[PDB]
């Protein structure tokens, strides 16, 4: 099993961009998707200030140069977790995109939770699902806020359960406990569609790469 | 299982400490990936504070030189009767044509704001753009 | 390589300046009885009532003329440290675009 570990699970960690996620997006595409449009300054969260380019007539503009690097890191992490056959759970309480996110989760062979989040789903999972239930290895937030404009409880619960989180954070969101935050607009349908496309493509590409690498290992 | 003190350190530091301490027999599946490609900031809980006194947020206001011109335009000729098409990435409003022509005059002549304004208006009327004051 | 600063400077939304009493073009993308959800290129859509005149032509994909009042509707209430947002723009439906 040592040779298998070394060649399959440790080889991809020796490359800066193993799955070539940098070619999935650019600053131009993020701009075309309106990823830079934040909320007005009155709704600004303090911890989001380092990610804000400026305020245009009282409307926060997200710095897309930083969004590009943050998205690069988040997509790389997601691809590496999908290559390792980890359970990926998408979460979003925005009802405008529930159907889209559930379809995308079904399509990439991963999991979705867009419905009401019952207390203890993660921290009390053994009581709710069964003693041998396996929890997600990665949780992705397309929207980190619930419908009362407070953080989704899953952010804190995943932090408690030591599950890394990727998240889209708008100017009024709190990115402190998200492991791989991606500053950007989470309200425009164009932007949410772009995020779903990117994450789905990264996951499917990583899984296909895993299959190809194992096939090469067995054949050769 | 790991520590549930989400406000002490981060998931990475807690997992690493509990692994070295021997509490956790094996590292979680994400640990090696995090170690190889860490995030730009370590996800440590911080309580957001309110700014009092002379503490102002460091966010700037996005202004450009041409904004001045735009203001004058929108104050003299008003908002153009033709509508804005924000879907078109290369949309060119009447005010934007005025701005570009004014900039061309400025770079090809002297700097007198009123003279630039009137000459730009004359040239735009020459090109065939309706401009009601 | 075009940097983000250039894109923002030359963006139509940036060029528009203040959004108050600005004429924009919107697209109807969702209909709920007589409520039309119109996207005009901003962060948020605007919800407009179907006019009583020529109401049948207002269908999904239709191009409309709008007079913007506010790009996002927010207001700070007593005892609140942050603005409350309704996640919707304010605009006035004028008619169809020929």
């Amino acid at each position: 099993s040592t040779d298998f570990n070394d060649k399959i699970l440790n080889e991809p960690l020796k490359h800066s961009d193993f799955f070539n996620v940098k070619e999935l997006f650019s600053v131009r595409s993020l701009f075309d998707a309106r990823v830079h449009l934040g909320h007005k300054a009155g709704c600004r969260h303090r911890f989001m200030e380092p990610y804000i380019f400026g305020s245009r007539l009282d409307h926060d503009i997200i710095d897309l140069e930083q969004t590009a690097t943050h998205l690069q890191l988040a997509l790389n992490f997601t691809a590496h977790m999908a290559y390792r056959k980890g359970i990926i759970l998408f979460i979003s309480r925005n009802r405008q995109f529930s159907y889209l996110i559930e379809n995308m989760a079904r399509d990439c062979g991963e999991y979705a939770h867009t419905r009401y989040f019952r207390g203890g789903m993660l921290t009390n999972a053994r009581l709710l699902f069964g003693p041998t239930v396996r929890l997600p290895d990665l949780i992705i937030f397309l929207h980190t806020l619930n419908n009362i404009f407070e953080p989704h409880v899953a952010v804190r619960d995943a932090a408690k359960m030591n599950i890394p989180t990727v998240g889209i954070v708008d100017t009024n969101c709190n990115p402190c406990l998200i492991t791989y935050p991606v500053p950007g607009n989470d309200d425009s349908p164009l932007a949410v569609h772009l995020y779903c496309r990117l994450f789905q493509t990264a996951i499917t590409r990583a899984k296909e790469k895993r299959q190809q690498v194992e096939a090469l290992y067995r054949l050769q | 299982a790991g520590s549930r003190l989400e406000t002490v350190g981060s998931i990475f530091s807690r997992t690493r400490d509990l692994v070295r301490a021997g509490v956790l027999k094996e590292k979680p599946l994400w640990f090696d990936v995090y170690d190889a490609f860490p995030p730009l900031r370590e996800p440590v809980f911080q309580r957001p504070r309110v700014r009092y006194g002379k503490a102002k947020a460091p966010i700037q206001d996005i202004w450009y030189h041409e904004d001045r011109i735009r203001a004058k335009f929108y104050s003299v000729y008003g908002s153009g009767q033709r509508a804005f098409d924000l879907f078109n990435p290369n949309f060119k409003s009447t005010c934007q044509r005025f701005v570009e022509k004014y900039t061309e005059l400025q770079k090809l002549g002297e700097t007198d704001e009123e003279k630039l304004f009137v000459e730009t208006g004359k040239a735009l009327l020459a090109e065939g753009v309706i401009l009601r004051r | 390589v075009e940097s983000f600063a250039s894109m923002l400077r030359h963006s139509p939304l940036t060029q528009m300046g203040p959004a108050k009493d600005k004429l924009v073009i919107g697209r109807i993308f969702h209909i709920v009885e007589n409520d039309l959800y119109i996207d005009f290129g901003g962060k948020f859509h605007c919800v407009c009532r179907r006019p009583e005149v020529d109401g049948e032509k207002y269908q999904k994909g239709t191009r409309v003329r709008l007079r913007l009042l506010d790009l996002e509707l927010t207001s700070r209430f007593l005892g609140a440290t942050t603005d409350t947002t309704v996640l919707e723009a304010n605009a006035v439906l004028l008619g169809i675009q020929e």
């Binding site: 400026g54 007539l57 | 700037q60 206001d61 996005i62 202004w63 450009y64 030189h65 904004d67 001045r68 735009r70 203001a71 929108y74 | 940097s3 600063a5 250039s6 400077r9 300046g17 203040p18």
Partner: peptide
């Protein structure tokens, strides 16, 4: 970069309007 924003007072601000009687005795 010449495309960066510049520090400036709000150029779109409408000045406070003068009353009917200001400047008159």
């Amino acid at each position: 970069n010449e495309d960066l924003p510049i520090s400036m007072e709000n150029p779109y601000k409408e000045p406070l309007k003068k009353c009917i009687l200001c400047g008159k005795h």
